[PDB]
């Protein structure tokens, strides 16, 4: 089953990333990104390697097999021999092609699940101060440097260090401050006017 | 694996929808819905058609096979012949039944993944102005006509056309306006009262 | 500042067949099928084969006098007949149970 990530809500892959299959792309105060994630791709490599080695070691090697001989009065046994050899040959080639054709969707859905889980982790440990925008990116209500980049990448974000300050910038963005505009609707008028009653009586 | 959509958080299917497997149901200012989504069901049809054609073309057709004859002194070869035929027959019927019994959950989980991905797309391009309610529906803080219905359906929603106006209606719903109630707690009292000190001195 | 999440891409053009699709371009792959071979006939574990040349096994065991060359051989790995191995029995007749003799021969 297509889990939705590869060629889904995430666009196609990255040419510039080299040393892995799963990486990040940061844009802090002093650089750009393209750094790998050596945890999850290691488990991916180990799983696929165990997979291929198992598929190799299940198929047994065959020993010597030589075609036999018959005279003109043993045609029946020869036809039986040909039926045996062709039947076993058809069974083995059917098993091989069917094994490959199931294993391919198995490994492609495995990669798709890896992408989606690595995305859900990054979203789940950035539960408010992120502002997702589309196709797997985040935009960071607070300020972040390389230290908190690697703090995201090792999964140790220590979120309540930033939680109030991020909140401040979030209240800048939409807020109720545009509804407020700085003063009250017009009450400061009435209090200029409650000072005007003073002037009019104390003339 | 049951991905959760069919007979899950979404209730059962729709009788009135005709021309597809995946559709929408809109209720704009001038009509009701039941329109299909010809993109995703086309890929579904093509995938299942390639699947069935592959399963057909892997099985080879068999040529002529006629039962043979033996006298009373060749019982050994005849028992060998019967063992050969029954063994191949059992292997072929086992492979056929096992192939069908795996292919059925493959295609059912394929349909389940299609439902869940088509739901995640509609949610992801309606990231604020939607107000989901349950069993795969949305309720649209702004106003929408047939043009923005097809703008949802082609996946081109151009969200920042509506983003402030939707926000206005969202601030109507819960807001802080019910906490505000129109004036201040009682400060307008003190400013009536700061006008009352005027009256009492300037008597 | 942000952290977009993505995956590897490459320039490889090799295709893998799958159930729901034909010709899926993959980044890395591995073959599991052999096609290459020499045109040579070498020895099994360092023991030379026995080439009859133009001789049949029957003419070799009977000692067909035109099979004069391979008179001194005693050991092999396997026996090579050719498409011109027609020098078997010079005098006409019937070598009875030739096939069973070949089957007993193939384990010595």
């Amino acid at each position, epitope marked *: 089953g297509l889990f939705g990530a590869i060629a889904g809500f995430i666009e196609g892959g990255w*040419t*510039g990333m080299i040393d892995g299959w799963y990486g990040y*792309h940061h*844009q802090n*105060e002093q*650089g*750009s*990104g393209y750094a790998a994630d050596q945890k999850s791709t290691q488990n991916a490599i180990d799983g696929i390697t165990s997979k291929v080695n198992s598929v190799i070691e299940k198929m047994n090697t065959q020993f010597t097999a030589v075609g036999k001989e018959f005279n003109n009065l043993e045609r029946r046994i020869e036809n039986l021999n040909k039926k045996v050899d062709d039947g076993f040959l058809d069974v083995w080639t059917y098993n091989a092609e069917l094994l490959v054709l199931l294993e391919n969707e198995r490994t492609l859905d495995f990669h798709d699940s890896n992408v989606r889980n690595l995305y859900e982790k990054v979203k789940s440990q950035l539960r408010n101060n992120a*502002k997702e*925008i589309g196709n797997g990116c985040f*935009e*960071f*209500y607070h300020k972040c440097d390389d230290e908190c980049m690697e703090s995201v990448k090792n999964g140790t974000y220590d979120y309540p260090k930033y939680s109030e300050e991020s909140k401040l*910038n979030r209240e800048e*963005i939409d807020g109720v401050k545009l509804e407020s505009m700085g003063v009250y609707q017009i009450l400061a008028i009435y209090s200029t006017v409650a000072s005007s009653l003073v002037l009019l009586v104390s003339l | 694996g049951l991905f959760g959509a069919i007979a899950g958080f979404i209730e059962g299917g729709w009788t009135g929808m005709i021309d597809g497997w995946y559709g929408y149901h809109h209720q704009n200012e001038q009509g009701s819905g039941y329109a299909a989504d010809q993109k995703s069901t086309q890929n579904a049809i093509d995938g299942i058609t390639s699947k069935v054609n592959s399963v057909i073309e892997k099985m080879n057709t068999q040529f002529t096979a006629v039962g043979k004859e033996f006298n009373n002194l060749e019982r050994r070869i005849e028992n060998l012949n019967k063992k050969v035929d029954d063994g191949f027959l059992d292997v072929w019927t086992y492979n056929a039944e096992l192939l069908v019994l795996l292919e059925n959950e493959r295609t059912l989980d394929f349909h389940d993944s299609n439902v869940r991905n088509l739901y995640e797309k509609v949610k992801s391009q309606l990231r604020n102005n939607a107000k989901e309610i349950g069993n795969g529906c949305f309720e649209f803080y702004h106003k929408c006509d047939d043009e923005c219905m097809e703008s949802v359906k082609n996946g081109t929603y*151009d969200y*920042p*056309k509506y*983003s*402030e106006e939707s926000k206005l209606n969202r601030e109507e719903i819960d807001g802080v306006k019910l906490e505000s109630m129109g004036v201040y707690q009682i400060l307008a009292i003190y400013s009536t009262v700061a006008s009352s000190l005027v009256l009492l001195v300037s008597l | *500042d*942000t952290i*977009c999440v993505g995956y590897h891409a490459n320039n490889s053009t090799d295709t893998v067949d799958t159930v729901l699709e034909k010709n899926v371009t993959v980044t890395h792959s591995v073959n599991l099928l052999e096609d290459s071979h020499n045109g040579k006939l070498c020895s099994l574990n360092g023991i030379a084969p026995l080439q009859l040349g133009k001789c049949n096994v029957a003419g070799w065991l009977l000692g067909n006098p035109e099979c004069d060359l391979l008179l001194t051989a005693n050991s092999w790995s396997y026996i090579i007949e050719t498409s011109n191995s027609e020098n078997g029995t010079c005098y006409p007749g019937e070598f009875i149970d030739y096939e069973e003799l070949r089957e007993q021969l193939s384990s010595v």
Partner: antibody
């Protein structure tokens, strides 16, 4: 049709302050980042600053840190840049410009302004 | 900080001919190079992005190539109007964003 109009130039005493403004017309101003690039007279180009699409990210060149701020208004479709405590070597012609995409690798700048002249001398 | 370098300083050419310019970097940007031309007293205009895909509304006699650290802009023919100032730009690693050094194009006689 997309164009960018800009103003705020003029001869100003050094150490002063300016508020340059670039208005936009013909597109959705609330869906792209914006940037500022100056040009010294008789010299090449020099990138100044950048603001993102939603305005959550601001960036400046390293030689001009702490003296320049930037903001944007959505309803006015307008970009504002505030200069503070200028120097004599910052006499240049300034350009507001639009990014072509919204990714990190944005791929150039397709639309431009037409240049305002700012002279900082005493 | 990726520092760019244009070459040569000034190209001289007769009309009805071609031209070629090289832009080099201090590190290896992948393909993320754009170019611009600029008439005197005008805003710069977009030519080519990613060194392969020409911009919308550009005649086909322009071309670009290159990868690694070196990149090349090529003009096939002229009609005496393309003589302007040329700029290369990377956008791989930023901020900050670095331009070229400017390269003008002269008529030869």
């Amino acid at each position: 049709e997309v164009q960018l109009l800009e103003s705020g130039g003029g001869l100003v005493q050094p150490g002063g302050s300016l508020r340059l403004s670039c208005a936009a017309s013909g597109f959705t101003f609330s869906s792209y980042g914006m940037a500022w690039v100056r040009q010294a007279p008789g010299k090449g180009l020099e990138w100044v600053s950048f603001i993102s699409a939603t305005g959550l990210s601001t960036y400046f060149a390293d030689s001009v840190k702490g003296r320049f701020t930037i903001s944007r208004d959505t309803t006015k479709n307008t970009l504002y840049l505030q200069m503070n405590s200028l120097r004599a070597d910052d006499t240049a012609v300034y350009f507001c410009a639009r990014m072509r995409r919204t990714m990190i690798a944005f791929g150039g700048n397709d639309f431009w302004g037409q240049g305002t002249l700012v002279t900082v001398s005493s | 900080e990726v520092v760019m370098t244009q070459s040569p300083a000034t190209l001289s050419v007769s009309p009805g001919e071609g031209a070629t310019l090289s832009c080099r970097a201090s590190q290896s940007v992948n393909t993320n190079v754009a170019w611009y031309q600029q008439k005197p007293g005008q805003a710069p205009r977009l030519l080519i992005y990613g060194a392969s895909t020409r911009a919308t509304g550009i005649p086909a006699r322009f071309s670009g190539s290159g990868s690694g650290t070196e990149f090349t802009l090529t003009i096939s023919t002229l009609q005496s109007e393309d003589f302007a100032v040329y700029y290369c730009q990377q956008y791989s690693n930023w901020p900050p964003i670095t331009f070229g050094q400017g390269t003008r194009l002269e008529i030869k006689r």
